[PDB]
């Protein structure tokens, strides 16, 4: 299939070269897989989700996304127009408050929750978890991510927006998970993107158009925007049977666009998510 005039990030992900505008992809579009979006929540009622989204857990008074970025993230994962895996199932887990904040304790609980909950869902093709959040190093937060990963869920997490080494950030510093850095339209590392040996891959994260609360759309930037591209790509490949939850991150890196990025400091991988689609 082909999506003309797609958002830059989607096109990038299906091209060996920057500057294209069509998103090529397999019609299967991730049907059969499930992506948990651990964020501020999801405006499930957004027409872009086509009823493929559901809230399954909140740690606050309401299950609603009063922030928007959670909706944005989910959109990049599997919205009709803005998503990578256009036919995936989305489950929102509200660990962050309407201000976009959350306590380590809550975030951990949210991870333990997905590990369990997945057992009651029908996701024949696999389970993914997308975590566009983080903070200062914590061994417990890291540990929670590792458990989730070991439970059979493909865990994708943002590298952080400090323009620093991701080693001092959690759950970014957890080696067993998939740490995602940001890239811009010109194949440059995103100015704010964290880097370091702990990163596994880069995805598009500068000026990302996607869904927003109130049934609208919005373009924002961050390693937070890149993460969902990877989570989406993972769901997509899983339904294709190319890879499993345990080896997805490595499969993505193996098959990535190599050496295309600029502004990549020595010691950081130079790999860009790539779907390798061939009509």
200 forms part of the interface with Ca ion (CB under 5 A): yes
- Return d(Cα 222, Cα 243) in angstroms, integer: 27
Distance, in Å, from the CA atom of 93 to the CA atom of 219, rounded to the nearest integer, reads 22
Partner whose binding site includes residue 200, from Ca ion, Hg ion, none (CB under 5 to 8 Å by kind): Ca ion
Strands 126-131 and 53-58: unpaired
Contacts of 11 (CB under 8 A, 6+ apart): 20, 21, 22, 23
Residue whose token pair is 């964020």: 39
3-class SS at 69?
helix
Rounded Cα gap, residues 92 and 70, in angstroms? 8
CB burial class (10 A; 0-12, 13-18, 19+) of residue 2? exposed
Applying CB under 5 A, the site for Hg ion has a residue count of 7
| Residue closest to Ca ion (Cβ) | 200
171 is in an annotated binding site: no
In the residue annotation, 46 being an active-site residue is answered as no
Q: Output 223 or 243, the one with its CB closest to Hg ion.
A: 223
d(CA 268, CA 256): 14
- The span from the CA of 152 to the CA of 165, in Å, is 28
Helix or strand run (H / E) with residue 254: helix 248-254
- Tell me: is residue 97 an annotated ligand-binding position: no
Is 132 one of the annotated active-site residues of the chain? no
| List 14, 33, 39, 130, catalytic entry | 39
Which residues, 141 to 180, sit near Ca ion by CB under 5 A?
175
Does residue 170 bind Hg ion (CB under 5 A)? no
State yes or no: 177 annotated in a binding site.
yes
Q: For the CB of residue 33, give the shortest distance to Ca ion in the complex, in Å.
A: 21
Closest approach of Ca ion to the CB of residue 186, in Å: 26
225 binds Hg ion (CB under 5 A): yes
Candidate list 46, 69, 72, 229, residue with the active-site label: 69
Catalytic-residue membership of 39: yes
Asked if 94 is part of the footprint of Hg ion (rule: CB under 5 A), the reply reads no
132 binds, among Hg ion, Ca ion, none (CB under 5 to 8 A by kind): Hg ion
Using CB under 5 A, list all residues that contact Ca ion: 175, 200
Instruction: Supply the residues annotated as catalytic.
Output: 39, 69, 224
Using CB under 5 A, list all residues that contact Hg ion: 39, 69, 72-73, 132, 224-225
């Amino acid at each position: 299939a082909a999506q003309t005039n797609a958002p830059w990030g989607l096109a990038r992900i299906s091209s060996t070269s920057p500057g294209t505008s069509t998103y090529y992809y397999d019609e299967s579009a991730g049907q059969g897989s499930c992506v948990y979006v651990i964020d501020t929540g999801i405006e499930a009622s957004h027409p872009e989700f086509e009823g493929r989204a559901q809230m399954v857990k909140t740690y606050y008074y309401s299950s609603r996304d009063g922030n928007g970025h959670g909706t944005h993230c989910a959109g990049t994962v599997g919205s009709r127009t803005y998503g990578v895996a256009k036919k995936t199932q989305l489950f929102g887990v509200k660990v962050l408050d309407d201000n976009g904040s959350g306590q380590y304790s809550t975030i951990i609980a949210g991870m333990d929750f997905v590990a369990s909950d997945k057992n009651n869902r029908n996701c024949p093709k696999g389970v993914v978890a997308s975590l566009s959040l983080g903070g200062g190093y914590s061994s417990s937060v890291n540990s929670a991510a590792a458990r989730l990963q070991s439970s059979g869920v493909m865990v994708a997490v943002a590298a952080g927006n400090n323009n620093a080494d991701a080693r001092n950030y959690s759950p970014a510093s957890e080696p067993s998970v998939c740490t995602v850095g940001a890239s811009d339209r010109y194949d440059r590392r995103s100015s704010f993107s964290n880097y370091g040996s702990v990163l596994d891959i880069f995805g598009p994260g500068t000026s990302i158009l996607s869904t927003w609360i109130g049934g609208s759309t919005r373009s924002i930037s961050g390693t937070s925007m890149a993460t969902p591209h990877v989570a989406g790509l993972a769901a997509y490949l899983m339904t294709l049977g190319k890879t499993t939850a345990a080896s997805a991150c490595r499969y993505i890196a193996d098959t990535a666009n190599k050496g295309d990025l600029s502004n990549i400091p020595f010691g950081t991988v130079n790999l860009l998510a790539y779907n390798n689609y061939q009509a």
